[PDB]
Design a binder for this molecule. Structure first.
Ligand code: CTP
Ligand code: CA
Ligand code: CA
Ligand code: CA
Ligand code: CA
Length: 903
DNA sequence: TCAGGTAAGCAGTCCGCG
DNA sequence: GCGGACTGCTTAC
């Protein structure tokens, strides 16, 4: 089989590589790699190396990597560009693996782990590491085994051996409910003493050294704790055994106030699952506890225990150990669903980077382009210093706040990447500039045609049409991968709606799930078989359909993020190909495209209605338009439609057969106008929105830019079994909005769009009646807390102190001596509650770490001094007043005199 | 901690305002 | 009270 690398590090003049050989085996080698960099040479030296601009360069092959980095510095102080790959381990992989890598994940050791530490004096600080490590669970992907290291004897308590039998039992039964399917995969190892546990945990680590190391907060807690504790007990060097090359780099001290620790282990790729999740999941969560993410992702219950975690081992050692095991498995379960490890490996190997570099699209693109250019004997330019400068982005139309009954939206496929490819935007394809007319003049096709020769953007930039730039070329490859994955994702989505529909009339039989591939649209045969299936079978098929969609999503949305990040990276000063003339060439072209097509759609729809100057496009943002379909419905009748699906069908047919071809001609003309390389402005119908036929629903509403709600029946060709609310930007969508209030507001909106005003009014009264009885957490606001030290003058609130930062300082002055109180962590999220004046906390709000209950000692005083009135007004009533007034509806009646009375 | 991006809404602070 | 200048935060794209 084909060779592939696992990890690569540069340690002095040595490249340290772990890899898989042609026989499927893991090996390791130290290489004194001889790197090459480049200088511009006179037009006399018959060389085969040229820069991207086509200017000759002489190759300089250094004896070692120290001399190369030295040469770079000497070139700088001489004022001359030193061209080539300055990150030598990237050059090394390029040379060593000069082909498209075909990797085998089965041969990659993926390890998932976590530890436990009992601490009777606050959060067991990883930097200090003064409390014994009393549990470690380590899952090895290759063995498929959960290795459990359990400490029986400690200064903080002598405990009994963990029991797999009790662990397997359900919590209803007094067990711990360790999932049944991993019980036979647990290798349990107990210990008389902390030293012999750590030594054995070092041995096995050498025997089964992780390539990919992950888990939950492993970079921030587990890795620095295991390192530092072995450092405090055995010393250094023995601690360095965690590295296959026995080289670590402690950073780290990030104060104030303060004061944490981060460890780099050379030869291991640390992909903290929390960081994978933040980057690739496309969520923004109110909490990042494993308990909260697991519930969200997997619908599993929280890991409940009695009393503080500082006394859990002592009071229930059994549960302590089970919960440590379960924590490790939850990350595996989250990953089986989300498949971020798979995604990290796909990308890392495609770019030929260290896998942990997939967090950086600048690194990723730098290596993709480097490899692309090297393969053509081209030489990459030196990275340069640039000042951070603002630059313009997208156009967003100002909507008239109103209700909008029937709406069809249209949106461009992969806009910024498509623009890159259409205009041929690249560092080396810059041809020149032209005199820029105001944007409005290009939008209205009245300005002089910019060029008859080059491919233009309305920001004044001209590009060669003839040759293909490296940026278009490489963005195209990844776009085509995204297209394929998105194709699978939408098929699984359509298939999911087929099953949901069938679930309306499930059959009374038994009966097995059909053995189908959910990535492909169901055939008629399969759809007929589906209509005959039981609920049980249908439900299992739905789960599989949704799992397939989710995998499809991860694959597609993160390739979209990658190619979009190339557009953004042209505007980041740390990118080798940073160029604001290219970054704005995209954004400005996008502004023109949107407004150009708004004009063409209005003109077409006016033409077909035989009118003039009516505005049909009601809104647009970046690359999308929203078109009022009222007249289209009202012209044919409304009573002529047998059902909702009949008019959805009608609008679908209209957009496809009438509007899309008009849109197609419009954009083709724009391409000619800008004399672009390739027409790639492909705008397809996205949403079809409206109220249920015969209802009093308002269908949709806008309050302002980036703030609207729509009742959608079809999204990009997915005909839903039940209408879906597409709500953008409103409080329902915000992670700062209380949990209960998100749901309440969504139901307010549902009733507005589907059922109408009386229905809303009925619901409002119900929620206002129940509010005070809801759980304090579910009704608490959420906020990230940055720069706490900046507004800490007391610790009392300083000048212009943010409301939530005030809450945090009010918190800190209540849990002063409390050793068992959780500390707010700079950058993390907090719940925030208003307090009634006169309260004992001495301020108008209290904030505390999100995802946790507030401490026992102060909990009851928060509850008694909570200001429900101010809370209900802030989080529920005020936003709702925004929605309803834009929609021209009331959530409440009158006031006003009577009353009437009954007696 | 160390390197995609901009546009833009709302919560809240502070203060001007006869 | 409301509004404008401003910071902070979180969203749409
Ligand atoms: N995180 C994001 C999302 C959007 N945009 C930009 O806004 C454009 C439109 O965004 P959107 O329609 O959400 O994505 P598209 O890239 O056009 O992809 P799709 O085909 O899914 O619509 C993108 O091309 C780009 C961006 O820079 N970064
Ligand atoms: Ca789009
Ligand atoms: Ca099968
Ligand atoms: Ca049926
Ligand atoms: Ca869009």
């Amino acid at each position: 089989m084909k060779e592939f690398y696992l990890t690569v590090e540069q340690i002095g003049d040595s490249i340290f590589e772990r890899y898989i050989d042609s026989n499927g085996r893991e090996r390791t080698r130290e290489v004194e790699y001889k790197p090459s960099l480049f200088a511009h040479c006179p037009e006399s030296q018959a060389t085969k190396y040229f820069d991207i601009y086509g200017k000759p360069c002489t190759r300089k092959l250094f004896a070692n990597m120290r001399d190369a980095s030295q040469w770079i510095k000497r070139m700088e102080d001489i004022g001359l560009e030193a061209l080539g790959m300055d990150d030598f381990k990237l050059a090394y992989l390029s040379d060593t693996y000069n082909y498209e890598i075909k990797y085998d994940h089965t041969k990659i050791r993926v390890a998932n782990f976590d530890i436990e530490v009992t601490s009777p004096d606050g959060f067991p600080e990883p930097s200090q590491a003064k409390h014994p490590i009393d549990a470690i669970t380590h899952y090895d992907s290759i063995d498929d085994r959960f290795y459990v290291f359990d400490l029986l004897n400690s200064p903080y308590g002598n405990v009994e051996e963990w029991s797999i039998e009790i662990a397997a039992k359900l919590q209803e039964q007094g067990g711990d409910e360790v999932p049944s399917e991993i019980i036979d995969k647990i290798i349990y190892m107990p210990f008389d003493n902390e030293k012999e546990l750590l030594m054995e945990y070092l041995n096995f680590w050498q025997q089964k050294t992780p390539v990919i190391l992950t888990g939950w907060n492993v970079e921030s807690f587990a890795i620095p704790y295991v390192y530092n504790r072995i450092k405090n007990i055995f010393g250094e060097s023995t601690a360095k055994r965690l590295s296959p090359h026995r080289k670590t780099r402690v950073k780290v001290i990030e104060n104030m106030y303060g004061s944490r620790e981060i460890i780099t282990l050379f030869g291991i790729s640390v992909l903290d699952y929390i960081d994978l999740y933040k980057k690739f999941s496309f969520t923004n969560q109110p909490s990042y506890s494993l308990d909260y993410i697991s519930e969200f992702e997997l619908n599993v219950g929280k890991l409940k225990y009695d009393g503080p975690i500082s006394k859990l081992r002592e009071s229930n050692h059994q549960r302590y150990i089970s919960y440590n095991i379960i924590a490790v498995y939850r990350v595996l379960q989250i990953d089986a669903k989300r498949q971020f490890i798979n995604l990290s490996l796909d990308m890392g190997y495609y770019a030929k980077i260290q896998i942990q570099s997939v967090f950086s699209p600048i690194k990723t693109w730098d290596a993709i382009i480097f490899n692309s250019l090297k393969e053509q004997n081209k030489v990459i330019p030196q990275g340069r210093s640039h000042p951070v400068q603002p630059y313009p982005g997208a156009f967003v139309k100002e909507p008239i706040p109103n209700r909008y009954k029937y709406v069809m939206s249209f949106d461009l496929t992969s806009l910024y990447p498509s623009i890159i490819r259409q205009v041929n935007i690249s560092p080396e394809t810059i041809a020149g500039t032209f005199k820029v007319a105001p944007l409005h003049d290009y939008i209205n096709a009245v300005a002089e045609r910019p060029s008859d020769v080059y491919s233009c953007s309305p920001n004044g930039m001209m590009y060669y049409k003839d040759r293909d730039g490296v940026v278009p070329t490489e963005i195209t490859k990844v776009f085509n991968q995204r297209k394929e994955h998105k194709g699978y994702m939408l098929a699984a989505q359509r298939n999911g709606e087929i099953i949901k529909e069938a679930l309306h009339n499930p059959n009374l039989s038994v009966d097995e799930p059909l053995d189908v591939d959910y990535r492909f649209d169901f055939s008629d045969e399969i759809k007929e078989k589906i209509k005959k299936l039981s609920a049980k079978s249908l439900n299992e098929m739905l789960f599989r359909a949704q799992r397939t969609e989710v995998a499809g999503m991860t694959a597609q949305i993160n390739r979209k993020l990658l190619i979009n990040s190339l557009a953004g990276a042209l505007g980041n000063v740390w990118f080798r190909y940073y160029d604001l003339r290219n970054a704005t060439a995209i954004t400005t072209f996008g502004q023109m495209a949107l407004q150009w097509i708004e004009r063409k759609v209005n003109e077409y729809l006016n033409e077909v209605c035989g009118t003039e100057g009516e505005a049909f496009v009601l809104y647009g943002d970046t690359d999308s338009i929203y078109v009022s379909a009222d007249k289209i419905i009202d012209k044919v009748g409304e009573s002529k439609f047998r059902d909702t699906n009949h008019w959805v069908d009608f609008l679908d047919k209209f957009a496809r057969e009438r509007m899309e071809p008009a849109i197609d001609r419009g954009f083709r003309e724009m391409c000619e106008y800008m004399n672009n390389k390739q027409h790639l402005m492909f705008m397809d119908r996205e949403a079809i929105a409206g109220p249920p036929l015969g209802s009093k629903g308002i269908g949709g509403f806008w309050t302002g830019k980036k703030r609207y709600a729509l009742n959608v029946w079809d999204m990009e060709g997915t005909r839903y079994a039940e209408p879906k609310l597409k709500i953008m930007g409103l409080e329902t969508q915000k992670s700062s909005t209380p949990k209960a209030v998100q749901k309440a507001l969504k139901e307010c909106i549902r009733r507005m769009l589907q059922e109408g005003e009386e229905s809303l009014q009925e619901y409002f009264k119900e929620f206002e009646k129940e509010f005070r009885q809801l759980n304090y957490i579910s009704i608490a606001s959420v906020s990230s807390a940055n720069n706490i030290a900046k507004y800490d003058v007391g610790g009392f609130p300083g000048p212009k102190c943010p409301f939530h930062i005030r809450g945090i300082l009010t918190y800190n002055r209540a849990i002063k001596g409390n050793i068992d109180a959780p500390q707010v962590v700079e950058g993390e999220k907090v719940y925030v509650l208003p307090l009634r004046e006169g309260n004992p906390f001495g301020d108008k709000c209290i904030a505390w770490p999100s995802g946790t209950e507030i401490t026992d000692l102060i909990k009851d005083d928060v509850l008694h001094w909570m200001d429900y009135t101010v809370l209900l007004e802030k989080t529920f009533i005020k936003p709702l007043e925004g929605f309803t007034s834009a929609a021209k509806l009331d959530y409440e009646k009158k006031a006003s005199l009577f009353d009437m009375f009954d007696f």
